[PDB]
Design a protein around this ligand. Sequence first.
Ligand SMILES: [Zn+2]
Lengths: 79, 308
Amino acid sequence: GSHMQIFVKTLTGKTITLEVEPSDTIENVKAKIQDKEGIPPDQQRLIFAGKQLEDGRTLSDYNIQKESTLHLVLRLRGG
Amino acid sequence: HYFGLVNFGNTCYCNSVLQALYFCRPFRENVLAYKAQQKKKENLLTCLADLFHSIATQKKKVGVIPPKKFISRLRKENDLFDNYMQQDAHEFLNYLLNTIADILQEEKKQELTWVHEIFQGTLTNETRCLNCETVSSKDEDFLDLSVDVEQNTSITHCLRDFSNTETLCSEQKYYCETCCSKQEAQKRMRVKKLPMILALHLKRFKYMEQLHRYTKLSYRVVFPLELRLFNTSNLDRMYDLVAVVVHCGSGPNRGHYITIVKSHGFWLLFDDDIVEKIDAQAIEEFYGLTSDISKNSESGYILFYQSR
Ligand SMILES: [Zn+2]
């Protein structure tokens, strides 16, 4: 059992499942979301435990275990 | 008092959030208490404390303050904001709070920081396998809740919807450890610990798979002046709206941020260097568009609710 299932609460509030590994980076997680939702990884922001997850870090670095819910959000840019 | 902030190159995303936070009374007080400790080393928190102290101690009641050192520091320590491009207010909000919390944690190290005492809440996620009826509970902290929206609704609907039971079925089946296989399940996220200040982020965006782009949702989403929220046991907490960060623009790639704040019973609108008193009825403009929802909207994006 090298992998575990996490959840992503998407833009409409619909929850999707993701099959991941502790060694998966946030970019890998965004690539898996892109496979289900079509959103490019560069537009995606993931919030977990009150923190926006950083590209280059892994699920183990953030201690994202099975049944974790990541919150997916995009951006409204303004000046 | 009531001072606008200078825009230093598409920095309204930062100004609007700084104004909302200035009018979050426990946050302002803890920042001012941090300034009072008179720290010698410079970081994002000391800059924020210097800025809040300049706002608090200005000789007049109305004017303009430049957040020059704060913006300079923000650009230096974060590659993400190290540019002159337009940015998202919620991304800035979450970054600022976590950066402050890390500075405070590193100072305790040299437990919960006062940033967590103010904004942190806890959810309990419960997943019930519909095949074996096993329930798995998982607690997860938050500094804000990102809620999905719908046309002609209230933040009360969005908040209750966030905590509604969802059935996981077909492609989203849950891997149950009792069943050792994917099963239909009911997932529900309930608030276990309500925060002192509840920050609500409206997911005003929709991705169009067929068009390879996303749009801004300028939906009518009413925000009430008061909100009562419940804990899964203090059984509940009454909140009052204190600030709203508003995104102005027809789309998600460009725009302008402003903030409305409640101060001594009246509403103020802060738009970078300009401050104006606004009537309570004028805040309704920020619920979002009724008709022609593709046009330029001024819509509520981050709401700040203060517990009574
Ligand atoms: Zn089961």
